[PDB]
Design a protein around this motif. Structure first.
Motif, PDB file in Angstrom:
ATOM      1  N   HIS D 233      17.351 -43.915  -4.659  1.00  0.00           N
ATOM      2  CA  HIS D 233      16.470 -44.726  -5.488  1.00  0.00           C
ATOM      3  C   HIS D 233      15.116 -44.066  -5.679  1.00  0.00           C
ATOM      4  CE1 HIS D 233      13.119 -47.646  -5.602  1.00  0.00           C
ATOM      5  NE2 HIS D 233      12.862 -47.221  -4.379  1.00  0.00           N
ATOM      6  N   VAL D 234      14.602 -43.420  -4.635  1.00  0.00           N
ATOM      7  CA  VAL D 234      13.336 -42.721  -4.743  1.00  0.00           C
ATOM      8  C   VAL D 234      13.453 -41.623  -5.798  1.00  0.00           C
ATOM      9  CG1 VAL D 234      11.759 -41.151  -3.589  1.00  0.00           C
ATOM     10  CG2 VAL D 234      12.665 -43.142  -2.363  1.00  0.00           C
ATOM     11  N   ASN D 235      14.561 -40.886  -5.790  1.00  0.00           N
ATOM     12  CA  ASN D 235      14.776 -39.851  -6.783  1.00  0.00           C
ATOM     13  C   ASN D 235      14.874 -40.428  -8.192  1.00  0.00           C
ATOM     14  OD1 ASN D 235      15.695 -39.700  -4.192  1.00  0.00           O
ATOM     15  ND2 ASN D 235      17.419 -38.325  -4.622  1.00  0.00           N
ATOM     16  N   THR D 236      15.613 -41.524  -8.347  1.00  0.00           N
ATOM     17  CA  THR D 236      15.773 -42.130  -9.682  1.00  0.00           C
ATOM     18  C   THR D 236      14.513 -42.722 -10.344  1.00  0.00           C
ATOM     19  OG1 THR D 236      16.461 -44.229  -8.688  1.00  0.00           O
ATOM     20  CG2 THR D 236      18.189 -42.659  -9.266  1.00  0.00           C
ATOM     21  N   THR D 237      13.739 -43.407  -9.518  1.00  0.00           N
ATOM     22  CA  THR D 237      12.521 -44.147  -9.813  1.00  0.00           C
ATOM     23  C   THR D 237      11.300 -43.403  -9.282  1.00  0.00           C
ATOM     24  OG1 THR D 237      12.708 -45.463  -7.790  1.00  0.00           O
ATOM     25  CG2 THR D 237      13.781 -46.307  -9.777  1.00  0.00           C
ATOM     26  N   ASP D 238      10.121 -43.842  -9.722  1.00  0.00           N
ATOM     27  CA  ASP D 238       8.896 -43.095  -9.437  1.00  0.00           C
ATOM     28  C   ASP D 238       8.357 -43.402  -8.041  1.00  0.00           C
ATOM     29  OD1 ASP D 238       8.967 -41.839 -11.928  1.00  0.00           O
ATOM     30  OD2 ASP D 238       7.833 -43.452 -12.892  1.00  0.00           O
ATOM     31  N   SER D 239       7.955 -44.663  -7.816  1.00  0.00           N
ATOM     32  CA  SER D 239       7.461 -45.185  -6.528  1.00  0.00           C
ATOM     33  C   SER D 239       6.264 -44.398  -5.984  1.00  0.00           C
ATOM     34  CB  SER D 239       8.580 -45.261  -5.482  1.00  0.00           C
ATOM     35  OG  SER D 239       9.015 -43.975  -5.075  1.00  0.00           O
ATOM     36  N   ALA D 240       5.420 -43.898  -6.884  1.00  0.00           N
ATOM     37  CA  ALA D 240       4.201 -43.199  -6.502  1.00  0.00           C
ATOM     38  C   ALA D 240       3.204 -43.318  -7.641  1.00  0.00           C
ATOM     39  CB  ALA D 240       4.455 -41.723  -6.186  1.00  0.00           C
ATOM     40  N   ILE D 241       1.969 -43.688  -7.309  1.00  0.00           N
ATOM     41  CA  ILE D 241       0.962 -43.998  -8.319  1.00  0.00           C
ATOM     42  C   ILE D 241      -0.322 -43.241  -8.013  1.00  0.00           C
ATOM     43  CG2 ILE D 241      -0.519 -45.807  -9.265  1.00  0.00           C
ATOM     44  CD1 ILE D 241       1.833 -47.731  -8.789  1.00  0.00           C
ATOM     45  N   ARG D 242      -0.850 -42.579  -9.037  1.00  0.00           N
ATOM     46  CA  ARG D 242      -2.131 -41.902  -8.947  1.00  0.00           C
ATOM     47  C   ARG D 242      -3.035 -42.538 -10.011  1.00  0.00           C
ATOM     48  NH1 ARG D 242      -1.422 -37.571  -8.145  1.00  0.00           N
ATOM     49  NH2 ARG D 242      -3.308 -36.437  -8.796  1.00  0.00           N
ATOM     50  N   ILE D 243      -4.196 -43.049  -9.603  1.00  0.00           N
ATOM     51  CA  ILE D 243      -5.136 -43.664 -10.534  1.00  0.00           C
ATOM     52  C   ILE D 243      -6.447 -42.897 -10.453  1.00  0.00           C
ATOM     53  CG2 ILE D 243      -6.294 -45.739 -11.287  1.00  0.00           C
ATOM     54  CD1 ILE D 243      -4.195 -47.388  -9.866  1.00  0.00           C
ATOM     55  N   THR D 244      -6.940 -42.444 -11.607  1.00  0.00           N
ATOM     56  CA  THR D 244      -8.191 -41.694 -11.688  1.00  0.00           C
ATOM     57  C   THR D 244      -9.187 -42.479 -12.534  1.00  0.00           C
ATOM     58  OG1 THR D 244      -7.658 -40.418 -13.671  1.00  0.00           O
ATOM     59  CG2 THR D 244      -6.831 -39.583 -11.580  1.00  0.00           C
ATOM     60  N   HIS D 245     -10.452 -42.458 -12.113  1.00  0.00           N
ATOM     61  CA  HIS D 245     -11.560 -42.987 -12.908  1.00  0.00           C
ATOM     62  C   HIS D 245     -12.037 -41.925 -13.889  1.00  0.00           C
ATOM     63  CE1 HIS D 245     -12.378 -46.945 -11.182  1.00  0.00           C
ATOM     64  NE2 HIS D 245     -12.121 -46.433  -9.992  1.00  0.00           N
ATOM     65  N   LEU D 246     -12.356 -42.357 -15.107  1.00  0.00           N
ATOM     66  CA  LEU D 246     -13.067 -41.481 -16.036  1.00  0.00           C
ATOM     67  C   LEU D 246     -14.566 -41.325 -15.744  1.00  0.00           C
ATOM     68  CD1 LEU D 246     -11.336 -42.438 -19.425  1.00  0.00           C
ATOM     69  CD2 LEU D 246     -11.049 -40.311 -18.151  1.00  0.00           C
ATOM     70  N   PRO D 247     -15.402 -42.378 -15.610  1.00  0.00           N
ATOM     71  CA  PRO D 247     -16.853 -42.117 -15.539  1.00  0.00           C
ATOM     72  C   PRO D 247     -17.336 -41.579 -14.198  1.00  0.00           C
ATOM     73  CG  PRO D 247     -16.508 -44.433 -15.296  1.00  0.00           C
ATOM     74  CD  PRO D 247     -15.155 -43.839 -15.554  1.00  0.00           C
ATOM     75  N   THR D 248     -16.578 -41.752 -13.115  1.00  0.00           N
ATOM     76  CA  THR D 248     -16.983 -41.244 -11.812  1.00  0.00           C
ATOM     77  C   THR D 248     -16.093 -40.130 -11.288  1.00  0.00           C
ATOM     78  OG1 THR D 248     -15.718 -42.958 -10.642  1.00  0.00           O
ATOM     79  CG2 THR D 248     -18.012 -43.455 -11.198  1.00  0.00           C
ATOM     80  N   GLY D 249     -14.841 -40.058 -11.731  1.00  0.00           N
ATOM     81  CA  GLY D 249     -13.949 -39.010 -11.276  1.00  0.00           C
ATOM     82  C   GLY D 249     -13.387 -39.227  -9.890  1.00  0.00           C
ATOM     83  N   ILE D 250     -13.006 -40.457  -9.560  1.00  0.00           N
ATOM     84  CA  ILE D 250     -12.446 -40.793  -8.257  1.00  0.00           C
ATOM     85  C   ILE D 250     -10.936 -40.894  -8.429  1.00  0.00           C
ATOM     86  CG2 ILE D 250     -12.381 -42.464  -6.375  1.00  0.00           C
ATOM     87  CD1 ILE D 250     -15.262 -43.252  -7.214  1.00  0.00           C
ATOM     88  N   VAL D 251     -10.197 -40.174  -7.582  1.00  0.00           N
ATOM     89  CA  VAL D 251      -8.746 -40.103  -7.663  1.00  0.00           C
ATOM     90  C   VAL D 251      -8.147 -40.749  -6.419  1.00  0.00           C
ATOM     91  CG1 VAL D 251      -6.750 -38.565  -7.920  1.00  0.00           C
ATOM     92  CG2 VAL D 251      -8.955 -37.959  -8.984  1.00  0.00           C
ATOM     93  N   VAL D 252      -7.214 -41.676  -6.627  1.00  0.00           N
ATOM     94  CA  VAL D 252      -6.531 -42.339  -5.517  1.00  0.00           C
ATOM     95  C   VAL D 252      -5.029 -42.171  -5.702  1.00  0.00           C
ATOM     96  CG1 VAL D 252      -6.018 -44.553  -4.431  1.00  0.00           C
ATOM     97  CG2 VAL D 252      -8.360 -43.942  -4.923  1.00  0.00           C
ATOM     98  N   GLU D 253      -4.372 -41.629  -4.677  1.00  0.00           N
ATOM     99  CA  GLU D 253      -2.944 -41.340  -4.683  1.00  0.00           C
ATOM    100  C   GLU D 253      -2.268 -42.233  -3.652  1.00  0.00           C
ATOM    101  OE1 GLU D 253      -2.455 -37.217  -3.848  1.00  0.00           O
ATOM    102  OE2 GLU D 253      -3.450 -36.531  -5.683  1.00  0.00           O
TER     103      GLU D 253
END
Lengths: 131, 38, 141, 348
Positions: D233-253
């Motif tokens: 299921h992990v291979n089939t589906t994503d199950s991982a999220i990365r969110i980045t801010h534009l005005p500050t440049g903060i990345v959370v994985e």
RNA sequence: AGCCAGGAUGUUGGCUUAGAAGCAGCCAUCAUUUAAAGAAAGCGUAAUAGCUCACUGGUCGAGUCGGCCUGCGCGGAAGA
């Protein structure tokens, strides 16, 4: 434009001013300036006051509608723009010559001074007025 | 040119035409008020 | 009597000779020099009173000078020494600022009739009284 | 003094009046604000300086003019006009020294800290809390002790205290800096004058406008496959999220759990925590960079105020006042020290 | 509906005196000359100036302008 009552009241007021009127004159301000209004109606206020109507409503069924009751010969004034100006005080006052004298004073066209009808006359420069 | 779905007469010189079935709002005064299908 | 060429009606109170902060380049926008509004500006100011804002004609010609006929100052700057209070509108009807009566404005009104256009003294009088009422002043009739 | 400052302002007014009529400057709005300040200052300056010059002339000429009585009466009338002109000049200085700005109306934080000689500082810092509490209860200010670290023989080592109201910071601007102490202390047996110092920080309100919006229109959310192990299921589906801010440049994985919505919750809570951390870190750096500029090293050096106790003198390094009281100063009444510093600080 | 005109003198009005002045925002939203003019709906200016519409005249001379109930349509309506 308003209905029958306002226009009829204006024409009846014009007839009632003609019935106590005097010598009049003509003017055609096709290119008129308010500075010229501030000479002629300033003259009107200089004489006695507010009473003189310079009403320009010479459509062939509006001011000509009041013509068969007073001064029928003015039915020929029915064509192109003429503004009437009556006189309550004074028989044949000096307002007749003043349009012709101000005709050179920034009032380029002034209806060719064809005048109005105390002796039932025509186009005339008349300085013979009671002064 | 504006390609909206709802068109109204913006200025006083707007005119409703039905060119090729496409309802257009033309303007002889301002070129910016001319727009697409309405 | 030619049409509108270059004349405007703007200058501050005539007791201030050559007002460079308030008007400044607005009188010197055309070819008329700044010195024209300090030497020839007080030829009529010293006749009556200094310190009242009086408009004057600024019809600029190409012959380095300009003709002018001085007009009447308005009632807005006139209701500071003849009204007592130096304030005015901003809260016209929410509170009563001051009051003048009819017999004073009617007496002052015909003195300003050299520039005003009216068929009678009473018409210009009630015009000036309505203009005074527009600042929230309540006339005592 | 004020006479040397008023002349430069009048010269700048005469320069701006000539530059306004030159019509060679495109930008005029800042010049119009300078002309407004010139009309506020130079008119009263040209009134007061000419009146004082005429008064000084009519005094110094008629004082020694062969002992006449009519010249003495003219000098008496000129002295009455001089008193009226001095009252008008004092009113003009009080009008020019007015805090129009709304930043002066804010509350403040006073930080009285000990410098050289700990015991002396403790005695002194407790008395400065007493000194500004006495000053504060005269005008009806609220005094609240937020933190106070005690000393050894009395007093306090560090005092951080909020004073609230209407206009604390604008009236207490000029107090950040050092304070000398020349005293015969109670902790000293010998009886030799000693020098002790204390440092006072004056901070404004700076009200906390915290928690800006997360702005999901500005969030870049990359939902991609996860690394690691566990299932097909992990291979089939994503199950991982990365969110980045534009005005500050903060990345959370986030690659933690199975479902992405638990991962969505963590990948927004960590964004909120990192926004709060990165904003409060900048706020604490902006506090510290101003406190290290206001508070010095704490030594016995000259920092704008020197207080003399055994001689009876209060001499400040700005606006050299020579008030010989030390008894109407120790119990409130700090107007005569604070006011002329404001009067010749708003001249610039 | 088009066409030859008008669409004013103080209003640089008091306002936070840096200017908002028919048209940023305040409120008052006067009154005269009057065929007519809102102390202003828009454009344009640091603010003016200026340009139109409101409205009123004249040539003209027969029907025209704007809302509401519905039937069938138009567009929004782009996938491998």
């Amino acid at each position: 434009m308003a209905l029958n009552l306002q226009d009829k009241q204006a024409i009846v007021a014009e007839v009632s001013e003609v019935a106590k009127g005097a010598l009049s004159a003509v003017v055609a301000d096709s290119r008129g300036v308010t500075v010229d209004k501030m000479t002629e109606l300033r003259k009107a206020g200089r004489e006695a006051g507010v009473y003189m109507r310079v009403v320009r409503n010479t459509l062939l069924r509006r001011a000509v509608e009041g013509t068969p009751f007073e001064c029928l010969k003015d039915a020929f004034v029915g064509p192109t723009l003429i503004a009437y100006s009556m006189e309550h005080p004074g028989a044949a006052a000096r307002l007749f010559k003043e349009f012709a004298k101000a005709n050179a004073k920034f009032e380029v066209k002034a209806a060719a001074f064809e005048g109005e009808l105390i002796p039932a006359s025509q186009i005339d420069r008349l300085a013979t007025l009671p002064t | 040119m504006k390609v909206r779905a709802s068109v109204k007469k913006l200025c006083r010189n707007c005119k409703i035409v039905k060119r090729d079935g496409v309802i257009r709002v033309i303007c002889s005064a301002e070129p910016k008020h001319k727009q697409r299908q309405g | 009597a030619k049409k509108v060429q270059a004349y405007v009606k703007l200058q501050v109170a005539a007791g201030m000779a050559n007002p460079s902060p308030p008007v400044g380049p607005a009188l010197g926008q055309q070819g008329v020099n700044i010195m024209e509004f300090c030497k020839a500006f007080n030829a009529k100011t010293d006749s009556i009173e200094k310190g009242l804002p009086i408009p004057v004609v600024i019809t600029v010609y190409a012959d380095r000078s300009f003709t002018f006929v001085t007009k009447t100052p308005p009632a807005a700057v006139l209701l500071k020494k003849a009204a007592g209070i130096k304030s005015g509108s901003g809260k016209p009807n929410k509170d009563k600022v001051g009051k003048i009566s009819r017999a004073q404005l009617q007496e002052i009104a015909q003195t300003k009739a050299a520039d005003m256009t009216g068929a009678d003294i009473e018409a210009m009088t009630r015009s000036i009284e309505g203009t005074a009422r527009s600042m929230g002043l309540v006339v005592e009739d | 003094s004020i006479v040397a400052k008023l002349e430069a302002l009048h010269e700048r007014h005469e320069e701006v009046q000539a530059l306004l009529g030159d019509a060679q400057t495109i930008a005029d709005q800042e010049r119009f604000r300078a002309l407004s300040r010139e009309y506020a200052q130079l008119s009263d300056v040209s009134r007061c300086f000419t009146d004082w010059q005429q008064v000084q002339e009519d005094i110094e000429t008629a004082q020694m003019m062969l002992d006449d009585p009519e010249m003495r009466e003219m000098a008496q009338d000129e002295l009455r006009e001089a008193k009226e002109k001095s009252e008008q000049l004092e009113q003009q200085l009080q009008v020019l020294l007015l805090p129009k700005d709304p930043d002066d109306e804010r509350n403040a934080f006073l930080e009285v800290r000990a410098g050289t000689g700990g015991d002396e500082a403790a005695l002194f810092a407790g008395d400065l809390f007493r000194m500004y509490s006495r000053y504060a209860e005269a005008r009806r200010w609220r005094v609240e002790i937020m933190s106070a670290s005690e000393g050894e023989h009395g007093g306090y080592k560090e005092i951080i205290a909020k004073i609230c109201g209407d206009g604390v910071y604008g009236r207490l601007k000029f107090e950040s800096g050092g304070h000398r102490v020349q005293r015969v202390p109670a902790t000293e047996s010998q009886g030799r004058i000693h020098t002790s110092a204390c440092t006072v920080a004056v901070m404004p309100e700076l009200p906390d406008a915290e928690l800006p919006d997360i702005n999901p229109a500005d969030l870049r959310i990359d939902t991609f496959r996860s690394s690691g192990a566990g299932g097909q299921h992990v291979n089939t589906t994503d199950s991982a999220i990365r969110i980045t801010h534009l005005p500050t440049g903060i990345v959370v994985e986030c690659q933690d759990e199975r479902s992405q919505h638990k991962n969505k919750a963590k990948a927004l809570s960590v964004l909120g925590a990192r926004i709060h951390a990165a904003e409060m870190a900048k706020r604490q750096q902006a506090e510290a960079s101003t406190r290290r500029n206001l508070l010095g090293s704490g030594d016995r050096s000259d920092r704008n105020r020197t207080y003399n106790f055994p001689q009876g003198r209060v001499t400040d390094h700005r606006i050299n006042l020579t008030l010989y009281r030390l008894d109407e100063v120790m119990e409130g009444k700090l107007d005569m020290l604070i006011e002329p510093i404001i009067q010749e600080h708003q001249a610039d």
